[PDB]
Write an enzyme that holds these catalytic residues in place. Sequence first.
Site, PDB file in Angstrom:
ATOM      1  N   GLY C  10       0.806  -1.221   0.000  1.00 30.53           N
ATOM      2  CA  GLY C  10       0.000   0.000   0.000  1.00 30.53           C
ATOM      3  C   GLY C  10       0.834   1.263   0.000  1.00 30.53           C
ATOM      4  O   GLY C  10       2.048   1.212   0.182  1.00 30.53           O
ATOM      5  N   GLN C  11       0.172   2.399  -0.210  1.00 28.42           N
ATOM      6  CA  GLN C  11       0.834   3.710  -0.236  1.00 28.42           C
ATOM      7  C   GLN C  11       1.719   3.931   0.987  1.00 28.42           C
ATOM      8  O   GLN C  11       2.903   4.242   0.850  1.00 28.42           O
ATOM      9  CB  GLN C  11      -0.193   4.850  -0.332  1.00 28.42           C
ATOM     10  CG  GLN C  11       0.440   6.236  -0.334  1.00 28.42           C
ATOM     11  CD  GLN C  11      -0.533   7.344  -0.666  1.00 28.42           C
ATOM     12  OE1 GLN C  11      -1.182   7.330  -1.708  1.00 28.42           O
ATOM     13  NE2 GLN C  11      -0.614   8.334   0.212  1.00 28.42           N
ATOM     14  N   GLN C  15       5.822   4.168   0.769  1.00 28.09           N
ATOM     15  CA  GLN C  15       6.505   5.438   1.062  1.00 28.09           C
ATOM     16  C   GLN C  15       7.368   5.379   2.339  1.00 28.09           C
ATOM     17  O   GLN C  15       8.392   6.069   2.435  1.00 28.09           O
ATOM     18  CB  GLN C  15       5.495   6.595   1.121  1.00 28.09           C
ATOM     19  CG  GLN C  15       4.794   6.826  -0.214  1.00 28.09           C
ATOM     20  CD  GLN C  15       4.085   8.167  -0.330  1.00 28.09           C
ATOM     21  OE1 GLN C  15       4.213   8.846  -1.346  1.00 28.09           O
ATOM     22  NE2 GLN C  15       3.329   8.548   0.700  1.00 28.09           N
ATOM     23  N   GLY C 143      -5.896   2.057   4.999  1.00 31.06           N
ATOM     24  CA  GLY C 143      -6.112   1.797   3.577  1.00 31.06           C
ATOM     25  C   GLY C 143      -6.696   0.429   3.258  1.00 31.06           C
ATOM     26  O   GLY C 143      -6.586  -0.499   4.052  1.00 31.06           O
ATOM     27  N   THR C 179      -7.868  11.178   5.031  1.00 31.54           N
ATOM     28  CA  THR C 179      -9.132  11.563   4.382  1.00 31.54           C
ATOM     29  C   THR C 179     -10.132  10.393   4.282  1.00 31.54           C
ATOM     30  O   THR C 179     -11.247  10.583   3.798  1.00 31.54           O
ATOM     31  CB  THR C 179      -8.895  12.150   2.973  1.00 31.54           C
ATOM     32  OG1 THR C 179      -8.152  11.218   2.177  1.00 31.54           O
ATOM     33  CG2 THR C 179      -8.138  13.469   3.065  1.00 31.54           C
ATOM     34  N   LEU C 252      15.205 -12.421  14.096  1.00 33.85           N
ATOM     35  CA  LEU C 252      13.774 -12.112  14.243  1.00 33.85           C
ATOM     36  C   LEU C 252      13.102 -12.876  15.385  1.00 33.85           C
ATOM     37  O   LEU C 252      12.155 -12.378  15.994  1.00 33.85           O
ATOM     38  CB  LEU C 252      13.021 -12.403  12.943  1.00 33.85           C
ATOM     39  CG  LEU C 252      13.322 -11.523  11.731  1.00 33.85           C
ATOM     40  CD1 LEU C 252      12.559 -12.044  10.525  1.00 33.85           C
ATOM     41  CD2 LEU C 252      12.966 -10.070  12.001  1.00 33.85           C
ATOM     42  N   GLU C 254      14.438 -13.529  18.240  1.00 37.29           N
ATOM     43  CA  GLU C 254      14.804 -12.892  19.511  1.00 37.29           C
ATOM     44  C   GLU C 254      13.892 -11.705  19.876  1.00 37.29           C
ATOM     45  O   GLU C 254      13.664 -11.460  21.063  1.00 37.29           O
ATOM     46  CB  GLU C 254      16.276 -12.462  19.500  1.00 37.29           C
ATOM     47  CG  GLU C 254      16.914 -12.420  20.882  1.00 37.29           C
ATOM     48  CD  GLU C 254      18.335 -11.879  20.867  1.00 37.29           C
ATOM     49  OE1 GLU C 254      19.105 -12.221  19.941  1.00 37.29           O
ATOM     50  OE2 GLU C 254      18.689 -11.107  21.787  1.00 37.29           O
TER      51      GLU C 254
HETATM   52  C1  LIG Z   1     -10.555  14.778   0.661  1.00 33.37           C
HETATM   53  C2  LIG Z   1     -11.581  15.395  -0.300  1.00 33.37           C
HETATM   54  C3  LIG Z   1     -11.978  16.755   0.277  1.00 33.37           C
HETATM   55  C4  LIG Z   1     -10.940  15.564  -1.688  1.00 33.37           C
HETATM   56  C5  LIG Z   1     -12.855  14.512  -0.382  1.00 33.37           C
HETATM   57  N1  LIG Z   1     -13.125  13.515   0.470  1.00 33.37           N
HETATM   58  C6  LIG Z   1     -14.288  12.985   0.122  1.00 33.37           C
HETATM   59  N2  LIG Z   1     -14.747  13.652  -0.934  1.00 33.37           N
HETATM   60  C7  LIG Z   1     -13.871  14.600  -1.255  1.00 33.37           C
HETATM   61  C8  LIG Z   1     -14.063  15.444  -2.294  1.00 33.37           C
HETATM   62  C9  LIG Z   1     -14.828  15.075  -3.424  1.00 33.37           C
HETATM   63  N3  LIG Z   1     -15.704  13.962  -3.352  1.00 33.37           N
HETATM   64  C10 LIG Z   1     -16.490  13.554  -4.437  1.00 33.37           C
HETATM   65  O1  LIG Z   1     -17.212  12.568  -4.263  1.00 33.37           O
HETATM   66  C11 LIG Z   1     -16.431  14.251  -5.658  1.00 33.37           C
HETATM   67  C12 LIG Z   1     -17.237  13.810  -6.712  1.00 33.37           C
HETATM   68  C13 LIG Z   1     -17.127  14.156  -8.056  1.00 33.37           C
HETATM   69  C14 LIG Z   1     -15.941  14.201  -8.777  1.00 33.37           C
HETATM   70  C15 LIG Z   1     -16.008  14.521 -10.138  1.00 33.37           C
HETATM   71  C16 LIG Z   1     -17.222  14.768 -10.779  1.00 33.37           C
HETATM   72  C17 LIG Z   1     -18.426  14.717 -10.075  1.00 33.37           C
HETATM   73  C18 LIG Z   1     -19.710  14.951 -10.630  1.00 33.37           C
HETATM   74  O2  LIG Z   1     -20.716  14.482 -10.095  1.00 33.37           O
HETATM   75  C19 LIG Z   1     -19.871  15.720 -11.797  1.00 33.37           C
HETATM   76  C20 LIG Z   1     -19.142  16.891 -12.068  1.00 33.37           C
HETATM   77  C21 LIG Z   1     -19.359  17.610 -13.244  1.00 33.37           C
HETATM   78  C22 LIG Z   1     -20.328  17.181 -14.145  1.00 33.37           C
HETATM   79  F1  LIG Z   1     -20.523  17.797 -15.188  1.00 33.37           F
HETATM   80  C23 LIG Z   1     -21.071  16.038 -13.884  1.00 33.37           C
HETATM   81  C24 LIG Z   1     -20.848  15.317 -12.715  1.00 33.37           C
HETATM   82  C25 LIG Z   1     -18.329  14.393  -8.716  1.00 33.37           C
HETATM   83  N4  LIG Z   1     -15.571  15.363  -5.748  1.00 33.37           N
HETATM   84  C26 LIG Z   1     -14.774  15.778  -4.646  1.00 33.37           C
HETATM   85  O3  LIG Z   1     -14.050  16.762  -4.807  1.00 33.37           O
HETATM   86  N1  LIG Z   2       2.731   7.807   8.094  1.00 33.69           N
HETATM   87  C1  LIG Z   2       2.206   7.695   6.858  1.00 33.69           C
HETATM   88  N2  LIG Z   2       0.890   7.405   6.745  1.00 33.69           N
HETATM   89  C2  LIG Z   2       0.327   7.278   5.517  1.00 33.69           C
HETATM   90  C3  LIG Z   2       1.142   7.461   4.307  1.00 33.69           C
HETATM   91  N3  LIG Z   2       0.324   7.288   3.259  1.00 33.69           N
HETATM   92  C4  LIG Z   2      -0.911   7.011   3.753  1.00 33.69           C
HETATM   93  N4  LIG Z   2      -0.899   7.015   5.094  1.00 33.69           N
HETATM   94  C5  LIG Z   2      -2.024   6.743   6.008  1.00 33.69           C
HETATM   95  O1  LIG Z   2      -2.599   5.470   5.691  1.00 33.69           O
HETATM   96  C6  LIG Z   2      -4.026   5.563   5.741  1.00 33.69           C
HETATM   97  C7  LIG Z   2      -4.600   5.389   4.342  1.00 33.69           C
HETATM   98  O2  LIG Z   2      -4.050   4.201   3.773  1.00 33.69           O
HETATM   99  P1  LIG Z   2      -3.144   4.137   2.433  1.00 33.69           P
HETATM  100  O3  LIG Z   2      -1.860   3.390   2.734  1.00 33.69           O
HETATM  101  O4  LIG Z   2      -3.056   5.478   1.736  1.00 33.69           O
HETATM  102  O5  LIG Z   2      -4.110   3.197   1.543  1.00 33.69           O
HETATM  103  P2  LIG Z   2      -3.618   1.996   0.588  1.00 33.69           P
HETATM  104  O6  LIG Z   2      -2.973   0.916   1.416  1.00 33.69           O
HETATM  105  O7  LIG Z   2      -2.837   2.597  -0.564  1.00 33.69           O
HETATM  106  O8  LIG Z   2      -5.028   1.348   0.127  1.00 33.69           O
HETATM  107  P3  LIG Z   2      -6.046   1.860  -1.033  1.00 33.69           P
HETATM  108  O9  LIG Z   2      -5.915   3.355  -1.153  1.00 33.69           O
HETATM  109  O10 LIG Z   2      -7.332   1.366  -0.417  1.00 33.69           O
HETATM  110  O11 LIG Z   2      -5.595   1.135  -2.284  1.00 33.69           O
HETATM  111  C8  LIG Z   2      -4.311   6.932   6.343  1.00 33.69           C
HETATM  112  O12 LIG Z   2      -4.376   6.812   7.776  1.00 33.69           O
HETATM  113  C9  LIG Z   2      -3.129   7.770   5.925  1.00 33.69           C
HETATM  114  O13 LIG Z   2      -2.891   8.858   6.815  1.00 33.69           O
HETATM  115  C10 LIG Z   2       2.571   7.773   4.518  1.00 33.69           C
HETATM  116  O14 LIG Z   2       3.337   7.951   3.542  1.00 33.69           O
HETATM  117  N5  LIG Z   2       3.008   7.872   5.789  1.00 33.69           N
HETATM  118 MG   LIG Z   3      -3.970   3.348  -2.232  1.00 33.75          MG
END
Ligand SMILES: CC(C)(C)c1nc[nH]c1/C=c1\[nH]c(=O)/c(=C/c2cccc(C(=O)c3ccc(F)cc3)c2)[nH]c1=O
Ligand SMILES: Nc1nc2c(ncn2[C@@H]2O[C@H](COP(=O)(O)OP(=O)(O)OP(=O)(O)O)[C@@H](O)[C@H]2O)c(=O)[nH]1
Ligand SMILES: [Mg+2]
Lengths: 63, 424, 437, 309
Positions: C10-11, C15, C143, C179, C252, C254
């Site tokens: 995962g991310q 990282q 994640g 997020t 490991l 230990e």
């Molecule tokens: C962490 C953070 C704040 C990013 C975040 N955490 C949860 N959410 C978010 C933010 C979003 N969540 C969404 O679900 C999203 C939905 C999205 C995306 C793209 C398009 C359309 C769409 O319906 C569309 C637009 C124009 C059009 F012509 C017809 C339809 C919706 N956009 C966001 O920025």
């Molecule tokens: N400390 C640290 N936390 C991270 C990092 N990247 C993501 N996180 C944390 O991990 C959680 C989200 O999981 P991610 O590892 O991004 O998700 P993933 O394993 O890539 O899984 P999917 O996005 O579901 O494919 C959140 O709590 C983030 O704050 C990093 O580089 N460092």
């Molecule tokens: Mg991911």
Amino acid sequence: MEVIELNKCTSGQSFEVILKPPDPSLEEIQKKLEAAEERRKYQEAELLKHLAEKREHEREVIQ
Amino acid sequence: MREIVHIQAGQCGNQIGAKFWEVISDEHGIDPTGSYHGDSDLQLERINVYYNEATGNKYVPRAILVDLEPGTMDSVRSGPFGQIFRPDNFVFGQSGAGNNWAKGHYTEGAELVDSVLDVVRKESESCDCLQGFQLTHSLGGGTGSGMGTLLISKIREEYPDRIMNTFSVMPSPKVSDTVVEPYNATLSVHQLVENTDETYCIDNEALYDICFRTLKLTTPTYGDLNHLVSATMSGVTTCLRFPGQLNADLRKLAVNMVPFPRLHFFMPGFAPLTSQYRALTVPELTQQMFDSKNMMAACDPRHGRYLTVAAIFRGRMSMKEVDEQMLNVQNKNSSYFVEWIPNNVKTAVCDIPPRGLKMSATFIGNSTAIQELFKRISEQFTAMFRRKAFLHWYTGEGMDEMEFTEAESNMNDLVSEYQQYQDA
Amino acid sequence: MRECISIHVGQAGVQIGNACWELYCLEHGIQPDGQMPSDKTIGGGDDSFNTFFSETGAGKHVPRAVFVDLEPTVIDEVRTGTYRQLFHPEQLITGKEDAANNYARGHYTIGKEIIDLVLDRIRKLADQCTGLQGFLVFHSFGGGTGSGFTSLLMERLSVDYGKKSKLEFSIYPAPQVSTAVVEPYNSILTTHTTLEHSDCAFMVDNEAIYDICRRNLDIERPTYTNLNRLISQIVSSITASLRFDGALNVDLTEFQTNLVPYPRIHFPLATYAPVISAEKAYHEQLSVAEITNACFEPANQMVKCDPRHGKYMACCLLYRGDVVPKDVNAAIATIKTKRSIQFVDWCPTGFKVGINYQPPTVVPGGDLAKVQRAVCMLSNTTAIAEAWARLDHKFDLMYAKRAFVHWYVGEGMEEGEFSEAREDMAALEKDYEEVGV
Amino acid sequence: MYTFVVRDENSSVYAEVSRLLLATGQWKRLRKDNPRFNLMLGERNRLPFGRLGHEPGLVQLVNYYRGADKLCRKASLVKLIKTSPELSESCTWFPESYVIYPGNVWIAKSGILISSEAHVIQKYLEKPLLLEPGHRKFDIRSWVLVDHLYNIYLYREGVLRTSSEPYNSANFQDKTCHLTNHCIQKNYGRYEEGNEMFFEEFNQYLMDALNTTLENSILLQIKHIIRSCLMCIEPAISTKHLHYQSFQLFGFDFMVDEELKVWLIEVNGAPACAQKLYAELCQGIVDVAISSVFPLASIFIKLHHHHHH
Ligand SMILES: CC(C)(C)c1nc[nH]c1/C=c1\[nH]c(=O)/c(=C/c2cccc(C(=O)c3ccc(F)cc3)c2)[nH]c1=O
Ligand SMILES: Nc1nc2c(ncn2[C@@H]2O[C@H](COP(=O)(O)OP(=O)(O)OP(=O)(O)O)[C@@H](O)[C@H]2O)c(=O)[nH]1
Ligand SMILES: [Mg+2]
Ligand SMILES: Nc1ncnc2c1ncn2[C@@H]1O[C@H](COP(=O)(O)OP(=O)(O)CP(=O)(O)O)[C@@H](O)[C@H]1O
Ligand SMILES: Nc1nc2c(ncn2[C@@H]2O[C@H](COP(=O)(O)OP(=O)(O)O)[C@@H](O)[C@H]2O)c(=O)[nH]1
Ligand SMILES: [Ca+2]
Ligand SMILES: [Ca+2]
Ligand SMILES: [Mg+2]
């Protein structure tokens, strides 16, 4: 307070200081990965069954 | 997951949809003929989400334009950015749909639906990783309402694993073409409850009031309403169209916004509201975007509770101050955020501001107060339906009174479902 | 020696991998291209650093690393980054579509179509080992890939490599840098399924690393880069005994014996001092007493909790720099009489000290200042259950309403697995209370 | 606008603190299970201290010190005094007590047994100070507020919870002369209202009958016992440097013998105030414990002594 098992070397040293004395198988994993895929495929079938009924209602209205 | 396929259906759908491609093409430095003339590499870094690349380094929107009459689509092609669209994607019939859902969904639109899906398949085919579909339409007319929901049901059959999002303009007596809008909207709402992952409830009531009360426009045109809509459409697509270390697609965002599958109708909002010189401070953006006056769906958020909130701040500001202000409104109004979804307000910041404003904020609220919207259309529906008024327009195209009775019941169920979580 | 394979899922896992392997390279003097001038046996070896690095005929030193992510964009930055030559492309495995913060999507749906590939690429590294110890697994609790796919990997690694030990480096979710809203679900689900498969696990609450980066590095809004460079210092501290000459924590097995007497309770708390800002003009260097004493301050712990209201089963002080045994014993003498360090009745009240004379290496242009001496205390205290209680409470609130559950069920998972997983955690909280009260 | 939660409905003290906070316009009460609070007025048993200080952008305070139960349960208090060097087995102000699990007069307690035959078994004070006219036993209650900084504030008003019956050496079974609790009495209110003699009167009696003061004869010993008890446990319970903060109101119960020596009987974690003094004490709890941490738009005596040696 006793300092036991002192071991030294050129890059460091270690010791202990005592202040006071006193799994499922490859069958079952691949089985239940697939059991979730059966529920995934049954749920998609129920959707395409439901959407198929919408297609026949669409025909019934225009007819 | 990078590519999104956009579909715009009907007069309204094509009007706001045209404005979307006008705003974002400016943001990405794409001119009216499709050529790039920007400066930042951030403008091209995720251009594949909404554009295909063509020969001579031209950028063509992944956009399909649908209507049952040529009129409005001829206006799109004539309009400022109309030359950028792929000519094959203009799919249109001749007879129109007379603000009739039945015509859109069952007769006229059924004749045209398969050729629209051929263009969708053409676009979906040459997509490295299609994340989903987005649609612009009204629920008050015939084409966007009736055919738009028909397309949504067909797309779901052929692409059951892809995300379906909509910007769905809700009708209001204040901005009203015909008396049968409540009928068309009620029939459409039942479709969206089943077949969309997110639906942005743009209420023409709300857009009118924002133009009248809080912008001092005495006689607001559709362009003044559409100006407010396009600002929000840009805002909700910001985090997909740019970075900035945010690793989210339509599904990931849908997963975090929609706790219950049927309750995916959001209350959009924007700060500042425009039609300026003094840039807003972070506290002002936060108070305005949470303010009822800035809501694009005419509901009072104090009458419900927030299931989830998302806010995306644009411009060069302090992320510390954003965190502080977002935490200030939650902790000082914690009754209106459900306690049974911890940490339900999430935030992002993007460095690139939109055209004109030095810093802005787009608000996406999944509040249970949206029941007010559905109750209002339910009241208008029943006022006519109890006397079977204007039904002949629909029964003439093959529909039964039963289908209306079902749709009435399905939306009143949605209202009851929203009430359940408001008291919990 | 005996080889150790590191797996980054995962991310967060990836990282954090980047930061560790960058740091390990600076510590052993290995350069970005992979050459190590100080290594005289070209083509092979059985030195302490060879536990983590393999060798080729050209002189390259290659991490025993596998990077796994269900989408490409994060591992793409490893392929194009400063340490691109360091890795063989087959170590860097990527899918096309991620798990959307969904345990069930990572474990069952997308997990299934990539699990057999990953184990194959793990087997390519195990076959280069003369005597494999086992695995260091790096991932996030929050994640979908981090939670979901990791637990499927750990299930299979027990089957394919039953004789080998498995250690976890887990990132526990913090709202202030996440997020995702559904992390409580993901964290409990993966903790339930990974528990019997994990021998020792080091939790790192993102809340604690973040506030350390605010308080001690003067960083206003800490990024992942700020957090990961600090985490990898702790990780290095922990793994230094496997990579350098020494007699404490040499393999490991230990880590389990020294830190984990009760097998289920395998979550040792890490505390780390000193964290000092490079931008600080004047710094008075801290003594052995001062930094050992800092290991019992909650504000330096990887997870915020109160060891005073709890009991120890094991403690380990790992020092780096100018430190000698008598300074450590004199510091422990002072600290015993001031602070509340209560042990369980069946365990000896004592400390296993490990010292390496090389001071901590700092990343050039990093946030951390050079220090004469530093320490990482690893203590198995029942106080860390505070983190489970918080997670479980959050789980209980959401799950009572069935909020978000449909996303999990829609990816083939059964609703019963939720309450099944929560009941294991309910027992785990009970196990900690029996021991510590 | 700060926020608080109330999780102890029985608490007569913090009901008044809840009321006084609300009646300002700067403290809103939230629901019992809302996480986004500044102040927790918490439950007696199983208070979730692990959930405190983990909500970003909220300074969180609770009205209980975690680990302070080791002073307030009788079994633990006896074990604390014998084991701590700074109190020790040879403690002059604590009666000789022993722990056995479920002049030679003793008292058993945790159903109270006073005999020589026969929980904790404590040495019974056979010759106590007896007020006149009445020839009757009492105990002194002192209220103590320990704030977030560990400033130990003794409240100036205490109270003597009196027996109304003449004290009897031979007759032990009769509880009304030996046990001096407010519930056990209700001659209820013969000499003073509700068997409560306040500090102004008790000082005057000592002046007239013994030619001394409360301040000298008794209160100097009380201040020493309070301060010795709390500074002993400071390392274990202090919330200095901690991610959440604690205060707590304690109730200290004392016995004064015939030769004017003060003995510690019990420390109380969730004490109730006397009817007259609620208004002043609860305003004091707000001013010193809560408003110091959360500022809006002296009744106590601070216990501090740094003797150099
Ligand atoms: C962490 C953070 C704040 C990013 C975040 N955490 C949860 N959410 C978010 C933010 C979003 N969540 C969404 O679900 C999203 C939905 C999205 C995306 C793209 C398009 C359309 C769409 O319906 C569309 C637009 C124009 C059009 F012509 C017809 C339809 C919706 N956009 C966001 O920025
Ligand atoms: N400390 C640290 N936390 C991270 C990092 N990247 C993501 N996180 C944390 O991990 C959680 C989200 O999981 P991610 O590892 O991004 O998700 P993933 O394993 O890539 O899984 P999917 O996005 O579901 O494919 C959140 O709590 C983030 O704050 C990093 O580089 N460092
Ligand atoms: Mg991911
Ligand atoms: N060693 C002793 N010598 C003389 N009297 C004693 C004593 N131990 C207890 N008592 C008497 O017994 C009474 C009640 O006992 P104790 O104070 O131990 O428990 P308690 O729970 O009733 C006090 P509270 O309810 O206020 O916390 C006291 O008021 C005191 O007068
Ligand atoms: N906000 C907005 N609403 C519109 C616009 N055009 C039409 N509407 C609304 O949409 C409804 C009519 O549907 P329309 O799109 O014209 O019908 P269609 O072409 O058959 O889909 C009415 O409720 C109008 O108020 C527009 O450009 N902007
Ligand atoms: Ca026709
Ligand atoms: Ca070698
Ligand atoms: Mg029209």
